Amino acid sequence: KEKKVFISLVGSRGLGCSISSGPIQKPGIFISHVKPGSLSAEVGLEIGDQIVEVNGVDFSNLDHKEAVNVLKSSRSLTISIVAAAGRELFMTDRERLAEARQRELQRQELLMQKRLAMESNKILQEQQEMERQRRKEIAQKAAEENERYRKEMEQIVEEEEKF
């Protein structure tokens, strides 16, 4: 899941980004700042990206000062990153809670939609059961009336057939 990016002709103003050493819970070298319009911005580096290799130097367990030395060691930098690996290190508490709220709201919106759709279908099935029993009773009443009507007509036909 690593991406490899290339920066050429690093000038005196430099990359236009900052690196920070991760804390104990999230160790590593992370991009903490990116200036708009900088070389790092033009090549797509973003705050929160983790740098895992630069110019063949492994950025795992590397201390801060050495990582800086490598990134200042050449005018051409090949930087391997895991994008957004440390994004939460540079998020405010409110931004992280807002994200958690939004994810919960999306699940809750679907749960409520399905709950009410299910309830409407329960009611609909109850209505079908009532109406089908009512119409079954109407049909059986009509059937037994017709059986009697047939016998009553046959009785009249017996009178009709007296000549």
């Binding site: 900052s18 920070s20 700042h33 801060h64 200042k72």
Partner: peptide, 7 residues
């Protein structure tokens, strides 16, 4: 704050 260097 984290140990930070601008490049």
């Amino acid at each position: 704050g984290l140990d930070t260097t601008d490049l």
